[PDB]
Structure formats: C-alpha cells, structure tokens
Design an enzyme around this catalytic site. Structure first.
Site, PDB file in Angstrom:
ATOM      1  CB  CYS B  41      74.452  28.663  77.651  1.00  0.00           C
ATOM      2  SG  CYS B  41      73.209  29.199  76.436  1.00  0.00           S
ATOM      3  CB  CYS B  46      75.478  31.089  73.910  1.00  0.00           C
ATOM      4  SG  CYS B  46      76.245  29.465  73.919  1.00  0.00           S
ATOM      5  CE  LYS B  49      78.775  33.484  70.167  1.00  0.00           C
ATOM      6  NZ  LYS B  49      78.493  32.929  68.811  1.00  0.00           N
ATOM      7  CE1 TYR B 180      83.564  27.428  69.170  1.00  0.00           C
ATOM      8  CE2 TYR B 180      82.268  29.451  69.170  1.00  0.00           C
ATOM      9  CZ  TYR B 180      82.601  28.232  69.749  1.00  0.00           C
ATOM     10  OH  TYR B 180      81.996  27.802  70.910  1.00  0.00           O
ATOM     11  CD  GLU B 184      81.678  33.381  67.977  1.00  0.00           C
ATOM     12  OE1 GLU B 184      81.748  33.588  69.213  1.00  0.00           O
ATOM     13  OE2 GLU B 184      80.809  32.630  67.464  1.00  0.00           O
ATOM     14  CG  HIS B 450      63.525  36.510  43.296  1.00  0.00           C
ATOM     15  ND1 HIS B 450      64.901  36.503  43.378  1.00  0.00           N
ATOM     16  CD2 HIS B 450      63.208  37.494  42.420  1.00  0.00           C
ATOM     17  CE1 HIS B 450      65.395  37.449  42.604  1.00  0.00           C
ATOM     18  NE2 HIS B 450      64.389  38.063  42.011  1.00  0.00           N
ATOM     19  CD  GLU B 455      66.436  33.948  44.862  1.00  0.00           C
ATOM     20  OE1 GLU B 455      65.517  33.589  44.070  1.00  0.00           O
ATOM     21  OE2 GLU B 455      66.723  35.154  45.063  1.00  0.00           O
TER      22      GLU B 455
HETATM   23  C1  FAD Z   1      82.491  32.516  73.907  1.00  0.00           C
HETATM   24  C2  FAD Z   1      82.008  31.668  73.973  1.00  0.00           C
HETATM   25  C3  FAD Z   1      81.006  31.523  73.031  1.00  0.00           C
HETATM   26  C4  FAD Z   1      80.289  30.356  72.944  1.00  0.00           C
HETATM   27  N1  FAD Z   1      79.365  30.419  72.010  1.00  0.00           N
HETATM   28  C5  FAD Z   1      78.622  29.389  71.831  1.00  0.00           C
HETATM   29  C6  FAD Z   1      77.582  29.506  70.809  1.00  0.00           C
HETATM   30  O1  FAD Z   1      77.398  30.510  70.204  1.00  0.00           O
HETATM   31  N2  FAD Z   1      76.814  28.486  70.631  1.00  0.00           N
HETATM   32  C7  FAD Z   1      76.863  27.313  71.341  1.00  0.00           C
HETATM   33  O2  FAD Z   1      75.915  26.548  71.052  1.00  0.00           O
HETATM   34  N3  FAD Z   1      77.853  27.127  72.314  1.00  0.00           N
HETATM   35  C8  FAD Z   1      78.688  28.101  72.549  1.00  0.00           C
HETATM   36  N4  FAD Z   1      79.689  28.043  73.544  1.00  0.00           N
HETATM   37  C9  FAD Z   1      80.032  26.719  74.207  1.00  0.00           C
HETATM   38  C10 FAD Z   1      78.881  26.211  75.038  1.00  0.00           C
HETATM   39  O3  FAD Z   1      78.211  27.336  75.660  1.00  0.00           O
HETATM   40  C11 FAD Z   1      79.173  24.939  75.845  1.00  0.00           C
HETATM   41  O4  FAD Z   1      79.163  23.736  75.133  1.00  0.00           O
HETATM   42  C12 FAD Z   1      77.970  24.999  76.686  1.00  0.00           C
HETATM   43  O5  FAD Z   1      78.305  26.032  77.589  1.00  0.00           O
HETATM   44  C13 FAD Z   1      77.381  23.800  77.465  1.00  0.00           C
HETATM   45  O6  FAD Z   1      78.241  23.468  78.525  1.00  0.00           O
HETATM   46  P1  FAD Z   1      78.063  22.342  79.583  1.00  0.00           P
HETATM   47  O7  FAD Z   1      76.630  21.998  79.598  1.00  0.00           O
HETATM   48  O8  FAD Z   1      79.068  21.187  79.503  1.00  0.00           O
HETATM   49  O9  FAD Z   1      78.299  23.179  80.897  1.00  0.00           O
HETATM   50  P2  FAD Z   1      79.078  24.528  81.168  1.00  0.00           P
HETATM   51  O10 FAD Z   1      78.362  25.557  80.399  1.00  0.00           O
HETATM   52  O11 FAD Z   1      80.583  24.519  81.188  1.00  0.00           O
HETATM   53  O12 FAD Z   1      78.529  24.803  82.707  1.00  0.00           O
HETATM   54  C14 FAD Z   1      78.702  23.971  83.903  1.00  0.00           C
HETATM   55  C15 FAD Z   1      78.284  24.640  85.185  1.00  0.00           C
HETATM   56  O13 FAD Z   1      78.847  23.644  86.058  1.00  0.00           O
HETATM   57  C16 FAD Z   1      79.359  24.188  87.309  1.00  0.00           C
HETATM   58  N5  FAD Z   1      80.424  23.263  87.998  1.00  0.00           N
HETATM   59  C17 FAD Z   1      81.648  22.792  87.494  1.00  0.00           C
HETATM   60  N6  FAD Z   1      82.121  21.752  88.126  1.00  0.00           N
HETATM   61  C18 FAD Z   1      81.267  21.531  89.192  1.00  0.00           C
HETATM   62  C19 FAD Z   1      81.368  20.619  90.319  1.00  0.00           C
HETATM   63  N7  FAD Z   1      82.474  20.232  90.976  1.00  0.00           N
HETATM   64  N8  FAD Z   1      80.240  20.607  91.040  1.00  0.00           N
HETATM   65  C20 FAD Z   1      79.328  21.624  90.954  1.00  0.00           C
HETATM   66  N9  FAD Z   1      79.264  22.655  90.088  1.00  0.00           N
HETATM   67  C21 FAD Z   1      80.271  22.516  89.190  1.00  0.00           C
HETATM   68  C22 FAD Z   1      79.912  25.456  86.633  1.00  0.00           C
HETATM   69  O14 FAD Z   1      80.007  26.374  87.649  1.00  0.00           O
HETATM   70  C23 FAD Z   1      78.993  25.941  85.528  1.00  0.00           C
HETATM   71  O15 FAD Z   1      78.099  27.019  85.855  1.00  0.00           O
HETATM   72  C24 FAD Z   1      80.528  29.199  73.794  1.00  0.00           C
HETATM   73  C25 FAD Z   1      81.559  29.301  74.783  1.00  0.00           C
HETATM   74  C26 FAD Z   1      82.308  30.528  74.924  1.00  0.00           C
HETATM   75  C27 FAD Z   1      82.978  30.576  75.671  1.00  0.00           C
HETATM   76  C1  FAD Z   2      55.861  45.085  43.855  1.00  0.00           C
HETATM   77  C2  FAD Z   2      55.898  44.194  43.455  1.00  0.00           C
HETATM   78  C3  FAD Z   2      56.630  43.283  44.196  1.00  0.00           C
HETATM   79  C4  FAD Z   2      56.711  41.968  43.809  1.00  0.00           C
HETATM   80  N1  FAD Z   2      57.471  41.267  44.620  1.00  0.00           N
HETATM   81  C5  FAD Z   2      57.631  40.020  44.364  1.00  0.00           C
HETATM   82  C6  FAD Z   2      58.510  39.277  45.266  1.00  0.00           C
HETATM   83  O1  FAD Z   2      59.086  39.799  46.163  1.00  0.00           O
HETATM   84  N2  FAD Z   2      58.697  38.027  45.010  1.00  0.00           N
HETATM   85  C7  FAD Z   2      58.172  37.341  43.945  1.00  0.00           C
HETATM   86  O2  FAD Z   2      58.626  36.177  43.865  1.00  0.00           O
HETATM   87  N3  FAD Z   2      57.300  37.987  43.059  1.00  0.00           N
HETATM   88  C8  FAD Z   2      57.038  39.251  43.253  1.00  0.00           C
HETATM   89  N4  FAD Z   2      56.217  40.014  42.392  1.00  0.00           N
HETATM   90  C9  FAD Z   2      55.359  39.324  41.344  1.00  0.00           C
HETATM   91  C10 FAD Z   2      56.210  38.665  40.289  1.00  0.00           C
HETATM   92  O3  FAD Z   2      57.379  39.485  40.040  1.00  0.00           O
HETATM   93  C11 FAD Z   2      55.434  38.044  39.121  1.00  0.00           C
HETATM   94  O4  FAD Z   2      54.820  36.813  39.367  1.00  0.00           O
HETATM   95  C12 FAD Z   2      56.596  37.825  38.250  1.00  0.00           C
HETATM   96  O5  FAD Z   2      56.861  39.135  37.795  1.00  0.00           O
HETATM   97  C13 FAD Z   2      56.627  36.845  37.054  1.00  0.00           C
HETATM   98  O6  FAD Z   2      55.809  37.342  36.026  1.00  0.00           O
HETATM   99  P1  FAD Z   2      55.536  36.710  34.632  1.00  0.00           P
HETATM  100  O7  FAD Z   2      56.640  35.768  34.370  1.00  0.00           O
HETATM  101  O8  FAD Z   2      54.107  36.208  34.395  1.00  0.00           O
HETATM  102  O9  FAD Z   2      55.834  37.957  33.716  1.00  0.00           O
HETATM  103  P2  FAD Z   2      55.800  39.512  34.000  1.00  0.00           P
HETATM  104  O10 FAD Z   2      56.840  39.751  35.011  1.00  0.00           O
HETATM  105  O11 FAD Z   2      54.471  40.212  34.112  1.00  0.00           O
HETATM  106  O12 FAD Z   2      56.548  40.015  32.610  1.00  0.00           O
HETATM  107  C14 FAD Z   2      56.115  39.833  31.220  1.00  0.00           C
HETATM  108  C15 FAD Z   2      56.908  40.628  30.218  1.00  0.00           C
HETATM  109  O13 FAD Z   2      56.026  40.382  29.107  1.00  0.00           O
HETATM  110  C16 FAD Z   2      55.940  41.497  28.174  1.00  0.00           C
HETATM  111  N5  FAD Z   2      54.633  41.477  27.304  1.00  0.00           N
HETATM  112  C17 FAD Z   2      53.291  41.488  27.720  1.00  0.00           C
HETATM  113  N6  FAD Z   2      52.447  41.080  26.811  1.00  0.00           N
HETATM  114  C18 FAD Z   2      53.191  40.873  25.663  1.00  0.00           C
HETATM  115  C19 FAD Z   2      52.778  40.568  24.303  1.00  0.00           C
HETATM  116  N7  FAD Z   2      51.683  40.995  23.654  1.00  0.00           N
HETATM  117  N8  FAD Z   2      53.831  40.285  23.526  1.00  0.00           N
HETATM  118  C20 FAD Z   2      55.099  40.659  23.878  1.00  0.00           C
HETATM  119  N9  FAD Z   2      55.559  41.168  25.038  1.00  0.00           N
HETATM  120  C21 FAD Z   2      54.526  41.211  25.918  1.00  0.00           C
HETATM  121  C22 FAD Z   2      55.982  42.552  29.294  1.00  0.00           C
HETATM  122  O14 FAD Z   2      56.415  43.697  28.672  1.00  0.00           O
HETATM  123  C23 FAD Z   2      56.919  42.137  30.412  1.00  0.00           C
HETATM  124  O15 FAD Z   2      58.237  42.712  30.401  1.00  0.00           O
HETATM  125  C24 FAD Z   2      56.038  41.432  42.634  1.00  0.00           C
HETATM  126  C25 FAD Z   2      55.265  42.338  41.838  1.00  0.00           C
HETATM  127  C26 FAD Z   2      55.189  43.735  42.199  1.00  0.00           C
HETATM  128  C27 FAD Z   2      54.688  44.344  41.578  1.00  0.00           C
END
Ligand code: FAD
Ligand code: FAD
Ligand code: GCG
Ligand code: GCG
Lengths: 461, 461
Positions: B41, B46, B49, B180, B184, B450, B455
């Site tokens: 690891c 891990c 990597k 993998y 990777e 959103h 989502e």
């Molecule tokens: C590239 C690469 C990427 C990986 N990426 C991921 C990842 O992203 N995510 C993930 O969750 N897992 C990943 N793994 C796999 C993962 O890391 C293994 O499942 C994990 O290492 C746990 O191993 P282990 O506990 O069995 O022991 P190991 O990690 O194999 O370690 C055992 C230790 O035991 C010692 N040893 C061996 N035999 C003896 C003995 N005779 N007596 C004393 N010491 C001894 C060794 O020296 C070693 O340091 C990756 C492996 C490689 C290679």
């Molecule tokens: C910057 C900024 C960022 C935002 N970011 C997010 C975000 O990231 N995530 C999120 O989930 N929400 C976000 N919101 C808020 C969100 O978008 C509102 O809750 C959402 O717009 C839903 O609004 P509503 O359905 O009540 O209608 P509104 O979106 O206010 O739209 C109503 C429509 O009704 C029309 N209308 C008004 N009155 C009448 C009437 N008399 N008759 C006919 N037409 C009319 C309008 O012209 C308009 O086009 C953000 C708002 C701003 C401003």
C-alpha cells in the site's frame, strides 16, 4: 376560456417537471412561460454557474502545474471567450427544452400570466383567459437589491444576473453577501484574477451551516486570497471617474466604528437576496395567502389556502435549490393525476452542495439543530481534518473537514457536513444512505475505497 | 522462545491492522516484517500509484487549458522531479508508521519469518524462535513475470515495482496485461508522454467487469491514444542496440496468425499477475493447506486447516485490494481478542475503484452474475450514457456510463457499475447504501445535487 386539466404558471424547474409528469399520466396540460424556458437553472443559475466554477478550477490547477513536474503558463485568461461558449451551451439547452416540450405534447402558452376575478380559479395571459381545476404557481424568485432610500448608490451594484452578463473580468470586485451565491461569486472572480473582497455583516459566512463549515469556509476564502471584510456594510456607493467608491462601515464588536472608502472598484455585487416573484401575479383577486415577504404559503402538500391552486420552488421560499423544485413539482403531479394521497416532498435530509474552493458538501441537520431536537447528551459528533493526497507534492494547500452528527443509542447518522476536494460528487451516496436512516454502523460496515477522501467518511473514529 | 498472544507475520496492510486491533483489546503482540512496513500500500502500490495518477490527470487538463480560456504550456514534463517528491512522501509515511507502531506498543520483530517443526505453532526469524496461540500469516503477494522457458527474453521486462523505480519517462512503452494494474499503468505513461501500447490476449480489457465497463474502458483507452493490441502475446523479447524488439503473435479469430516485430521499445511491462508469497514460509512443516497456485486456503473466518494459524490479504488470493486486507485483519482481532463469534468479513458488495482515464467505479455484482443467481426474468438493468458538463466547452471529450442491476420485485440494487469523471469519490456513498440492501426506490427518493454526475445515478429511468 380554454379549459385544461393542468395549468402551470412559470416554465422553470418546478413546473416544467410537474406539467411533464402530468402529461405522462395523461392530461391536457399547458405551461405559461413569460420568456426563457429552463427558468433559472438553465439561463442564469445552476448551469452558467458550474461552467464558470469549472473555469475557476483550472486556475487552481495551473498554479500547481509546476509542482506536478510540468513547466507553467503565465496568466492572462480571456473571460470574453469562456463567456461566449457558455452562452452557446445555454442556447443548445434551450433548444433541447423547446423541442422536448413540444414533443411530450404540452401547450406552451407564452406570455405573462395573472389571476383574474373569475369566481373559479382562472388566469389571463396577454389578454387571453385560460383555466383548469389545478393551476400550479411556479413563478420563481429574483435577486434582491437595496433601495436608494437606504443605500444611496444602490442601483450602481450588479447582481448574479448581471454577473452572467459580464463581457470582461472586472479587475476589482466587491461582493456584499455571506451566503452561498456570494461565496460562489467571490471564489470564481478571485481564482480568475479579479482582486476581490467579500463584505459581510459578521465574522463568518454561511452562518446557516454547521460551525465547522461556516468556519472552515471563511478561512479558506482567506487563504485563497479573498478579503473577508467583517462587521461591515456599504453606507453609500459613488461612481467616481475611476470606477466606484464604496463607503462602508466596519463596526467590530468591542471597537469603535470606522467608515472607509473603497476606490477604483470595477464591480459591486448585491449577493444578498432572492425575493419571491409574486407581485404582479395579482393573487389578491383570490385571496391567495402569503408571507410578510411575498412568498406564497402552502401546506405539506403544496396547497395554497385556495382550492385548486398550488405552489412550488423558490416562490414558496423553502429549500431554494433546483432539485427541490423538481422533487416538489413531480411529486404533486402524482398526488393529483395518479390520485396518490401520500405524494409530498419530505424536506428533511435534502442535500446541498456549495461550489466554493474547495467544494462544500452537506446533508441532514447540524449539531445544533440536532442537540436541540435530541439532547446535548444524545448528540455525538465524529470528525476528521486531513490534507487531500493531492497536496502531498504541492506548496498550495487546502484541507478537508468531515463531521458526522449521530443521534441516540444506535448512533443514527442524522447529519453529514464536509468541505474538500471532490466533495461535489462525494455527497449523494451518503444522502441516499442518510435518507434511509443509516446508523454509524452501516457506514462502518462498508469496505473502503483506497486511496480516496471518501474512505475517510466511513473510517470515522 | 518468546511467547506472545498474537504473532502476525508480514507487516503490510492486513496484519498491521490486525496486530493493532489486538493491542487495542489488550494483547502481547508482535509483527514480523522482512523489510519496509506499510507493505505494498505504502511502498509500491496504492500510494505511489495515486501520486502518478494525479500527475496524469494534470496533462489531461493542460490539454484543455486553451478551451477554458487561458493560453497553454508546451509539453516537456520532467518525470525526474515528480518521482523524487513521491519518494519523500513514501519516506514520511514510513516514519509515521515506524512511530505509530512503536507508540501503540507492539513488538516489531524485524527479519524473515518461517514455520518450524515445533509441535505447536511456532515461527523462527533470523535464527530466533517466537510462538503464540494465534499466528496470522499476512505475507502478501508479488508480481508474476514469465519464465525464460516459455518466453525467451522474459527477464528483460519490468513490473509495477520497477515502474516505481523509473527515473525517466520511457518514450516507448509496451504493456502486457488486460487487468487493472495494466490498464492503470498504460494510462499514466500515455497521458504523460510515452507512446504506449497495451497488448491483450483478447478484444477487451477488464474482462472480469460488467460488459459496459470492459467495453467502455477499451474504447476510452483507444480515444485516449493507447494502442490496444488484441488477440496478441509476446513470443520473444530481444534487446537490440536500439532498445528492445518485441516479437508478438496476433491470432485474431477468423483470420490467419501474424507474427510481428515491435522495435525501439524503451519499457516492456509484465502486468499479468500477483502470485502469493508463500514459498519460503515453509508451511510444509505444519501441513498448512494451500491452492494449486500457492495461495493459502482459509474458511469464511480466515482459519487455515491448522488450528491457531490464519491468513488475510493478497496471500489468500481473494479481493486483492488494501481495504479487504484491513477489514479482514481487524475483524479477526475481534473474533479472537474480543471473543466475537460473528466477526468475519462479508466479501460481497466490496467496492473497487480503478483509476483509468476516466475513473472506473464499481460495487456489487454484474448483470451476468446476477442473471445467474436470480433469473433472466428477475434481473432488470437501468443505464445512462451522457457527457460530463466539463466537456460542454471542450474539444477533448470522454463519456460517463452508469448501470444499475436490480433484483426481483422490489428492484433491489444489487450491482452499480460506472466510468466517468469524479467516479473515484462518487462511489462509497452508494456502497454503504448498497451494503444496506437499498432498493431502486431509496435511490429514487433521494433529492438530487445539481449540477453533478452523481445526480444521474439517482434519476435512472
Ligand atoms: C500497483 C499497484 C496498485 C495497487 N493499487 C491498489 C489500490 O489502488 N487500491 C487497493 O485498495 N489496493 C491496491 N493494490 C493491492 C493492495 O495494495 C494489496 O491487497 C495490499 O497491498 C494489502 O496487502 P497485504 O496486506 O496482503 O500485504 P502486502 O501489502 O503484500 O505486504 C506484506 C508485507 O509483508 C512482508 N513479508 C512477506 N513475507 C514475510 C515473511 N516471511 N515474514 C516477514 N515479512 C514478510 C513484506 O515485506 C511486505 O512489506 C495495488 C497493488 C499494486 C501493486
Ligand atoms: C447563481 C445562482 C446559482 C444557483 N445555483 C444553484 C445550484 O447550483 N443548484 C441548485 O440546485 N439551485 C441553484 N440555484 C437556485 C435554483 O436554480 C432555483 O431553486 C431553481 O431555479 C428552481 O426555480 P423555480 O422552479 O421556482 O423557477 P425559476 O427558476 O425562478 O423559473 C421560473 C420561470 O418562470 C417564469 N415566470 C415568472 N412569473 C411568471 C408569470 N407571471 N407567468 C409566466 N411566466 C412567469 C420566469 O420567466 C422563469 O423563466 C441558483 C440560483 C442562482 C441564481
Ligand atoms: S437546468 C434544468 C434542470 N435539469 C436538471 O435538473 C437535470 C436533471 C435530470 N436529468 C432532469 O430531471 O432533467 C431541471 O430543472 N430540469 C427539470 C425539468 O423540468 N425536467 C423536465 C424533463 C426533462 N427530462 C429530460 C432528460 C434529458 C433532458 N436534458 C436536457 O434538458 C439537457 N440537460 C439538462 O437538463 C441538465 C442540465 S442543463 N443536464 C446536465 O446537467 C448534464 C448531465 C449531468 N447532470 C451533469 O451535471 O453533467
Ligand atoms: S497505505 C497504508 C493503508 N492506509 C490506509 O488504508 C488509510 C486508511 C485509514 N485511515 C487507516 O485505517 O489507516 C493501510 O493499509 N493502513 C492500515 C493499517 O494497518 N493501519 C494501522 C492503523 C493506522 N491508523 C492510523 C490513522 C492515521 C495514520 N496515517 C498514516 O499512516 C498516513 N496515511 C495513511 O496511512 C493513508 C495512506 S498513506 N493516508 C491517506 O491515504 C491520506 C488520507 C486520504 N485517505 C487520502 O487518500 O487522501
């Protein structure tokens, strides 16, 4: 008067989604759109945003290119270009929507709708009256900008909309707001060049999230090169010969207030609100009940106080995200047209991802909401703070913070909060799990993916 | 003879993890390591990597820098550098491990272990004998390279180990393998310059995964610029004055075999196997039963046929990933030291992520394993094929394929397969869900994020 089975006002996310499910269950439906379909999601929200965010994530890498063993570039990012391309995508998207609707066979009445006197629920559109037993109001919500009364020079600031209209990266940006659209806007401009400043009333942003998030995100904005201006607010704005002159007041607790000038500002952003779009709907004629801020009021089934009138999305003022619009709009179509008495959207455990740098990911409730709903003795929180393996070879560093809020004996995972690399596509799986009342054990019984950040969320000790 | 309560041979993932849990439950434990702790690891798996993979993901972006509106670079990536830094990290990691072990108070006997005659379970190490009621064998597994008998010029090829020893990016790479570590290796070298070729016996790689994966991944390797050489194998390898000359046979079904020369090859990689490390363990003296390929054989509790002797990780030859080593090693410590009769690792729904370009993510069983365990009538598969929003503005494109294998009436999600951007941190949440018998509904009841790729996995139709 053209009678339908479904009449959906507004053609954005909530709504398009409903009318669509309604047509699916067999129904004479129409959608009244005032201009661009796709609403906010397509036109000036989710989509245009992610494109820019994506552009920003590229500067962050260009800064690490040398560390990873390649040479470098130089700077000069042409905003003009990425801007153009993002628009052609919105265009492609609109055309898809144009076609999609017309193919699912839905009457897209186009124009501005409004309610009339007409005894039974009825709307007009450009001098034409349409009616139908069920009318859904999905009129969205717009950006809130200050009044010249309070802030002289208010109208000189631009909002998200205008941001998506910028043809050149503003060398000096000033952003007022401490929420997510603010945080998001601040990050993109900063990464992409603009010497930005985020003016917030307090000491931290995203004050509505978990302590850890609101905290870690203020900090990250800082190390990123943003400029958090705490306990500050703009007194007045004045267009100089240079650009703008922001006069803001810094009233830090325990200190004496100080009034400051912020010169040669290119862009001043009003990232403060989303007022509902309810005004000229002329609800008044039916007594459709509302908020003291215009939001429509509905019950746990999206019913207004009037029979045959519903509301969904931004307008209702709850869970202002696209998917809540969808999930609420489509669930309705089934209550009505499938005759399903239990179809309603459970507004708990709704997941939200905020695209700052790095990405904020979070679902469920916070420690505090929890502690309140359970008991200080009943809430256990697990957390980790590590550095993504991506910065084992970089100078430029960012963290990753993960917190798990558990409830009662069984340690029910009732809140997951995190910030870090890949945290955008990291959350969702856990949202499903969390949505299905997962316990800390289920989390702990899941075999890890190594090497990942996600593995850290399941090995919490 | 020094008596302990636990004696763990091998100091890699499985093992370190066990001995550690054993010390935790109160136990006189030792770990016999032959050389570098952290095993595979840390040292040659891990971690080294992912660093390289990470480096590769940077070329993929450098190729899109222009599209995102910035200028460009030029090429010339210095492998020498990234190599060095990756090593200093392995060093930091080793030191952490050195310290961690010595702090948790575990006798790290160092040297080569082996079993003796000694009536009751007993091992020697460099002429010293240690024994203890429970001895766990975690001797890992090594890379399999061909015999000069079969392939004259066999020894001229390098393996993963040697790959992690390369001091310069080999201009011409040749990789033999369709699994993998092969996939990777092929991807990293290609992205980072080397004109690579992946020689595989058949038509597709990862033949052990779902059709979609094995298919989509062969295709992606192709569009990426790799060179899949199908129905091919190396006859002989010959060190010319230029480099190497690979003579390989292309026996395509329905055609006539053709023998080809592959000149001026810099590197020839044996990415074909992981033979267990069992030979000089001298199991023979106890009759410890094994595979016909050296792997140790254990039961569903990691018990060898001998009492007081167990096995975990690569050596057993099942689920050859780090977390399975851990999960199996630690679960054992509880059966034994906590006296827990039910502690054993459920080898089903184990999640695996393969880091190709793009990332392969997958958990549970495939359509075929399913169809067999259920019934062609009982297995329903949902799938999507879309383009990440990341390529709305790029010329360079990659896809994303998601498949859901459901079982019976309730549509139990029993297998999730995917390839695409962010698919590395995307999987895990669903693994927990899947591990907790999630149905297609639970997936469908989860509110979306959103805009994301994730989502798409919850909106499957
Ligand atoms: C590239 C690469 C990427 C990986 N990426 C991921 C990842 O992203 N995510 C993930 O969750 N897992 C990943 N793994 C796999 C993962 O890391 C293994 O499942 C994990 O290492 C746990 O191993 P282990 O506990 O069995 O022991 P190991 O990690 O194999 O370690 C055992 C230790 O035991 C010692 N040893 C061996 N035999 C003896 C003995 N005779 N007596 C004393 N010491 C001894 C060794 O020296 C070693 O340091 C990756 C492996 C490689 C290679
Ligand atoms: C910057 C900024 C960022 C935002 N970011 C997010 C975000 O990231 N995530 C999120 O989930 N929400 C976000 N919101 C808020 C969100 O978008 C509102 O809750 C959402 O717009 C839903 O609004 P509503 O359905 O009540 O209608 P509104 O979106 O206010 O739209 C109503 C429509 O009704 C029309 N209308 C008004 N009155 C009448 C009437 N008399 N008759 C006919 N037409 C009319 C309008 O012209 C308009 O086009 C953000 C708002 C701003 C401003
Ligand atoms: S911005 C509009 C928004 N779209 C989504 O939420 C996409 C999620 C899901 N596929 C969906 O339900 O559409 C939204 O508000 N849509 C709701 C609406 O009312 N839907 C009516 C039915 C449409 N279903 C047809 C499915 C194929 C249609 N595709 C398009 O319209 C084009 N693209 C999309 O709508 C979205 C955003 S532009 N596509 C993507 O985000 C790309 C894929 C992936 N999610 C990603 O983020 O890369
Ligand atoms: S490569 C060794 C491998 N490590 C892991 O699987 C890390 C996962 C988890 N935190 C863990 O259980 O260690 C492994 O085989 N470890 C097993 C072992 O036997 N563990 C004994 C107990 C050690 N637990 C101490 C926790 C802190 C120790 N940290 C270090 O040793 C340094 N880093 C790590 O071991 C891993 C790999 S080098 N760290 C990371 O991968 C970084 C964080 C994140 N997972 C990421 O991928 O970025």
């Amino acid at each position: 008067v053209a009678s339908y089975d479904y009449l959906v006002i507004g053609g954005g996310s909530g709504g398009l989604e409903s009318a669509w499910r309604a047509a699916e269950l067999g129904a004479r439906a129409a959608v009244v759109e005032s201009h661009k379909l796709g609403g906010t999601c397509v036109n000036v929200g989710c989509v245009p945003k992610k494109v820019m965010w994506n552009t920003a994530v590229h500067s962050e890498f260009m800064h690490d290119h040398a560390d990873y063993g390649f040479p470098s570039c130089e700077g000069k990012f042409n905003w003009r270009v990425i801007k153009e391309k993002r628009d052609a995508y919105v265009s492609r998207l609109n055309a898809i929507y144009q076609n999609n609707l017309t193919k699912s066979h839905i009457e897209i009445i186009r124009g501005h709708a409004a309610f009339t006197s007409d005894p039974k629920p009825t709307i007009e559109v450009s001098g034409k009256k349409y009616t139908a037993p069920h009318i859904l109001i999905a009129t969205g919500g717009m950006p809130s900008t200050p009044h010249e009364s309070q802030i002289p020079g208010a109208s000189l600031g631009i909002t998200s909309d205008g941001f998506f209209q910028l043809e050149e990266l503003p060398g000096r940006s000033v952003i007022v707001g401490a929420g997510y659209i603010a945080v998001e806007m601040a990050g993109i401009l900063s990464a992409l060049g603009s010497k930005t400043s985020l003016m917030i009333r307090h000491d931290k942003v995203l004050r509505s999230f978990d302590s850890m998030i609101s905290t870690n995100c203020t900090e990250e904005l800082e190390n990123a090169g943003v400029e958090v201006l705490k306990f500050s607010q703009v007194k007045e704005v004045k267009k100089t010969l240079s650009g703008l002159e922001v006069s803001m007041v810094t009233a830090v607790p325990g200190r004496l207030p100080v009034m400051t000038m912020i010169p040669d500002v290119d862009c001043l952003l009003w990232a403060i609100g989303r007022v509902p779009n309810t005004k000229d709907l002329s609800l008044n004629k039916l007594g459709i009940q509302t908020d003291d801020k215009g939001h429509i009021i509905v019950d746990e089934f999206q019913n207004t106080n009037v029979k045959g009138i519903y509301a969904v999305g931004d307008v209702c003022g709850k869970a202002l995200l696209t998917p809540v619009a969808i999930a609420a709009g489509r669930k309705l179509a089934h209550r009505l047209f499938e005759y399903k008495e239990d179809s309603k959207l459970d507004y708990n455990n709704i997941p939200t991802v905020v695209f700052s740098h790095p990405p904020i990911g979070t679902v469920g409730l916070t420690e505090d909401e929890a502690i309140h709903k359970y008991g200080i003795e009943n809430v256990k929180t697990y957390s980790t703070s590590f550095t993504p393996m991506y910065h084992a070879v970089t100078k430029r560093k960012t963290k990753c913070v993960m917190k798990m809020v558990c409830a009662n004996k069984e340690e029910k995972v009732v809140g997951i909060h995190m910030q870090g690399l890949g945290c955008d596509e990291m959350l969702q799986g856990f949202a499903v799990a969390v949505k299905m009342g997962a316990t800390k054990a289920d989390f702990d019984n899941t075999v890890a993916i190594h090497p990942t950040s996600s593995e850290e969320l399941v090995t919490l000790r």
